[PDB]
């Protein structure tokens, strides 16, 4: 049965057992690529440090 | 008073409240550059990932 489940993305994430777009995140102080498969949860997030794009970046990549 | 304290480096580290050369280390799960000053201890170690030195490395650095 194809059911169109509505609701908040933090609810659709827990219904779908996935992470969708605007769900709550689980930032837990260590890196997601350090976790094994069984301890990765859908929602394990990571806010990376920034990087300023410059003209030298464009030149070196081109 | 000057005292030449002998012993193992893991003992001289705890006597001098420093880390010396061959003491036991407190390798934990997170990065020592993430800790503040009051939660750094002398002995907070980090085994970094490797980097293979190649001829291209020598050329680009020269």
Alpha-carbon gap: A37 to the closest alpha carbon of chain B (Å): 18
Read off φ and ψ for residue B9, nearest 5 degrees: -65, -30
Q: Is A26 helix (H, G, I), strand (E, B) or coil?
A: strand
A13 burial (CB, 10 Å; 0-12 / 13-18 / 19+) is: buried
Buried b (16+ CB within 10 A) or exposed e, A27-42: eeeeeeeeeeeeeeee
Residues of chain B contacting residue A30, judged by C-beta atoms under 8 Å apart: 29-30
Q: Is B20 helix (H, G, I), strand (E, B) or coil?
A: coil
Neighbours of B9 (CB within 10 A): 13
Question: Could you tell me the two tokens for A45?
Answer: 């997030």
Residues of chain B contacting residue A29, judged by C-beta atoms under 8 Å apart: 30
Residues of A with CB under 8 A from a CB of B: 29-30
From the DSSP assignment, how many helices (H) and strands (E) are in chain A? 2, 0
Query: Hey, which residues does B44 pair with through a beta bridge?
Result: B26
Chain centroid to CA A49: how far? 15
In DSSP notation, B8-37 reads: -HHHHHHHHTS--SS---B--SS-TTTS-S
CA distances from B10 to A60, B6, B20, B21, B45 (A): 48, 11, 8, 9, 14
Residues of chain A contacting residue B29, judged by C-beta atoms under 8 Å apart: 30
With contact defined as beta carbons under 8 Å apart, do A23 and A13 qualify? yes
Q: Is A32 helix (H, G, I), strand (E, B) or coil?
A: helix
With contact defined as beta carbons under 8 Å apart, do A44 and A32 qualify? yes
In DSSP notation, A27-45 reads: --SS-GGGS-TTT--TTB-
Q: Which residue's entry shows tokens 């012993």? A: B7
> How far apart are alpha carbons A22 and A20 in whole angstroms?
6
Residue in chain A closest to B34 (alpha carbons) equals: A29
Residue in chain B closest to A29 (alpha carbons) equals: B30
B1 burial (CB, 10 Å; 0-12 / 13-18 / 19+) is: exposed
- Give the Cα-Cα-Cα angle B22, B29, B9 (nearest 5 degrees): 10
Solved with: cryo-EM
């Amino acid at each position: 049965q194809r059911t169109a489940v509505q609701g908040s993305p933090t609810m659709l994430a827990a219904i779908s057992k996935q992470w969708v777009r605007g769900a709550k995140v689980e930032e837990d102080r260590i890196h997601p690529f350090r976790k094994y498969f069984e301890e990765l949860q859908p929602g394990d997030s990571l806010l990376t440090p920034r990087r300023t794009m410059t003209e030298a970046d464009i030149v070196n990549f081109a």
